[PDB]
Amino acid sequence: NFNLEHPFFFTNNDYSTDTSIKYQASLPFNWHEVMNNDEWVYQYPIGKFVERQGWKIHISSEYNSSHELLQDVAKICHEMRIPFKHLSTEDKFIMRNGKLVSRGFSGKFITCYPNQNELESVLQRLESALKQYNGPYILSDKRWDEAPIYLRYGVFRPSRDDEKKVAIDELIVGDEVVKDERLPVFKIPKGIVPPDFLNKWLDKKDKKQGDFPFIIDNAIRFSNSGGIYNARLKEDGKKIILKEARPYTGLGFDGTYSSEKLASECKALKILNEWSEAPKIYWHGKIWEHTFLGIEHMKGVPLNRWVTNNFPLYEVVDKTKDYLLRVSKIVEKLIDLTNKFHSENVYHQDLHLGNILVKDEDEISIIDWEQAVFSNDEKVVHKVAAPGFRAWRETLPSEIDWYGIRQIAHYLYMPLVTTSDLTYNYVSQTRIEGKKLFESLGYTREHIDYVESLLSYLDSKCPQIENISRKKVLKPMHEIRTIESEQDIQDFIIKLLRGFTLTYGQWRKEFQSRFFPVAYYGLNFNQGIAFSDLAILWSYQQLAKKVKNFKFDDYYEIRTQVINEAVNNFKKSSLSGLFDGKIGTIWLIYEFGEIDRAVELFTTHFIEIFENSQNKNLYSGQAGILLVGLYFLSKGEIDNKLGEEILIRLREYTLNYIENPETFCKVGASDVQSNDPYENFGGLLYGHAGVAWLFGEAYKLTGESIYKNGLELAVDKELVAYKVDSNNRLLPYLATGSAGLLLLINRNKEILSSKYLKYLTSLERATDVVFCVLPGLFNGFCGLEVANNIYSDIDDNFSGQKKLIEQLYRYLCVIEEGFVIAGDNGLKITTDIASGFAGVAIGLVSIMDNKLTILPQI
């Protein structure tokens, strides 16, 4: 998990170190051990014919008896001629029985494949020769006999040359193919007559001796054994939320199942039955073999929703200021109740936004006590932790809760706790930033002194330790200084560029796949303007040219090497349907130099990358091609014979857009968020204001009558989504709207009428938020500020820097002189266009000259 995860940067799937104890058995002759895809170890008897589509036996086992059951079952199968396979290592066995594993594939340890004409010689032998048996219940079958023996009708080895229509995990009866039922309930597939000695087994049935007095009503997605749902009790009408403890599943890396975790929660909440919150157990009973734990649910909201609903994002929001009485009250209640439960030697070891519940009149409530330990005299490392609430170097159970309370109080002070697993003592950023943030809104000095005093009181409780986690280079900043002159900008630029020898060479010394690290979404992407190793160095080029100091280190050989690794990526990307071109790479080559090959590549790969687009978009379709295509003919690099077809496509796209605008412009009313889900239609890059940008740049190039009408239609296609609902929670950002459409209006401000410009002032107060979570320009903070004062036609660049850099000091972690930014889901360091360095590099270089090098301005 966290130890298997590579520190600092993200990593690919190919990082299996596999430092554990392997699982294997002794091989006789007439047998051989072959290796499958790094998880299974398969053994077959040579000369023996193995069939297809037979009655597979699946065997599950627990952790301590894993070796003995594996050796016994292997010695049974090697004596016979039944093919045999099992798990490779101990870590894959933990992963097959963990908490984050899918419940469709859980506990499958041995899947032996005996003959279809001989099962009665197999099953009684496997029942009788196993003796001691302590295995779990797979969500496949219905527990043949008492030993963990399970008869799933699955699929054997793939079809040979004599058997056509291979159909992996699809063949059941005959010529037709039905998909393999991966439902967790056992289901006999349509067809397939069972054997005569299994028809008596597949009747079973049992009478009733109780009816589990708690009625489940609704549910949500499970994880491995329980889930988030709601239920009602049989006796009383009070709402109950019980938890399901399937036996021998949900292991951590240590040998701890979820059953003793819920037992620890039961023993914590039995003694915690009188301190208002932390409700007592209404019912606890082992029925059949599972374990259930009924804990009532109180009326309240999680602390994340309370922060996002109660925070001064705007001046109109949270009138008459206040908010520090509420923050100090809930923190003081947290401190008082934390000191209360630290008397009977019980703790929490998991503090999170979803663990603290608040309600009307600001009454706190603490839930999720499954990681409580009843003894405090040893030093243990924090095993499971929320993303931002993880300790360092085996702290005590006494002050793991104090560390969690410190981190959640710094979240309540100013909500950026999410990178505390990356940089140790990150809260020194948020304290100094929130002090000058609340000094600017107008909150009173005695309330700010009170909250700073209680915050320092919790800072006096964190154990100041030596930082040994291979993250010692990542340190916070205590040099939060104001901006006075241009030297205070140029020193920031030279330090921020000087950190790149370190943050690039450290990526070189352990990874060879890419040249620059990226986010988890854009790790596989390696070309274009979204996530590439070329646009980052491109942005570095103008950021070095915008400052006097040269920053020598490494520019020649890397600038030659990026061309050599990018020359073979013009051929789609070796796997590409719609992003085969991603044109604008030729614009990066134009910025890099040697334009004589860029013009040739642009004339070569222009036509075949247009008809393949299906979902029309600037990024996932063909609309973003024409923006780059008009740039070369405006610059005078191509011929008129090539440009005539481009202009024909320009004229043809407008008629298709204004004929039926609902052909591809579906936004689905509500916010589309970002990344994959909800179809990503908010505006511009991930939406349909990119065609408005196309119309603006095309009409700035040449004058046409249909271009203005299509431009007004594209503006009104987003202006109908004017739901500003008393400011903002919602999704303002830049790549989803608001600031992007502000940019569109301020670009061609001389073209549109006054009715659209009247909306600009009323949306300026909507986009003037004092806080955002992410630090990038697509779905972050600085995308707002690069778009705020971009075409003001006045020299306010220094005011823009004095806004942006001082607001950017909160997301900055220093590498010994050089600054760096954690990106989206900010647990891991990264650099890319979306959320990282280049998201502020383009912001700086655009805000200091008003050019906006994301897209051409002609």
Binding site: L183, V185, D206, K208, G210, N218, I220, E244, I287, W288
Partner: peptide
């Protein structure tokens, strides 16, 4: 002890989104 429906109702998904 000896019920068998606690596995045979565990597959339900319904809807509980707020």
């Amino acid at each position: 002890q000896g019920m068998a429906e606690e596995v045979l109702n565990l597959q339900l998904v319904s809807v509980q989104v707020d």
